[PDB]
Design a protein around this ligand. Structure first.
Ligand code: HEM
Length: 153
């Protein structure tokens, strides 16, 4: 697809939409995750010992926010510059994933959880051109973190 001026414009627009409702979109995101894979629950400190996904847990919200921000920033960087840049942050990310017992096969779990979360976020404005644009941006960012985990192990 690339990332035409027209596609980037489409990701920015859709992320602004996500940020607009953190406690919802983040609890939704954790449920889509536990739907695709239930065992994932024991991983998260704030999910252990609980029976359901907490809805107002600051720890959980802050956590999931950070996750989507990172995928958006990735799309813009692709349109302007043509790439996704690896920094300190992406590297520390790779460490903590490993401490917590996270693997590569976990990634399509979280991707489908994010496309489905954004399809849910933009509703009728959804286009092939937009799906194509977030897909390209996740794929490109996952490529980068998986790369850093393997390096933290
Ligand atoms: C491009 C995709 C991804 C991004 C951008 C991302 C980002 C992050 C960030 C920023 C943190 C730390 C947040 C904090 O300090 O508050 C974190 C923690 C964590 N992540 Fe991810 N992540 C991704 C994929 C995954 C996958 C596929 C899994 C596996 C299910 C996972 C499992 C975890 C766990 C268990 C923690 C520790 C939470 C704790 O017990 O408090 N992440 N992630």
């Amino acid at each position: 697809g690339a990332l035409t001026e027209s596609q980037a414009a489409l990701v920015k627009s859709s992320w602004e939409e996500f940020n607009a409702n953190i406690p919802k979109h983040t609890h939704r995101f954790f449920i889509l995750v536990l739907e695709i894979a239930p065992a994932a629950k024991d991983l998260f400190s704030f999910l252990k010992g609980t029976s359901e996904v907490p809805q107002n847990n600051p720890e959980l919200q802050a956590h999931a926010g950070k996750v989507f921000k990172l995928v958006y920033e990735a799309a813009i960087q692709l349109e302007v510059t043509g790439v996704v840049v690896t920094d300190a942050t992406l590297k520390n990310l790779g460490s903590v994933h490993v401490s917590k017992g996270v693997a590569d096969a976990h990634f399509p779990v979280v991707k489908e959880a994010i496309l489905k979360t954004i399809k849910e976020v933009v509703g009728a404005k959804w286009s092939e051109e937009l799906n194509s644009a977030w897909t390209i941006a996740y794929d490109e960012l996952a490529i980068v973190i998986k790369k850093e985990m393997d390096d933290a192990a």
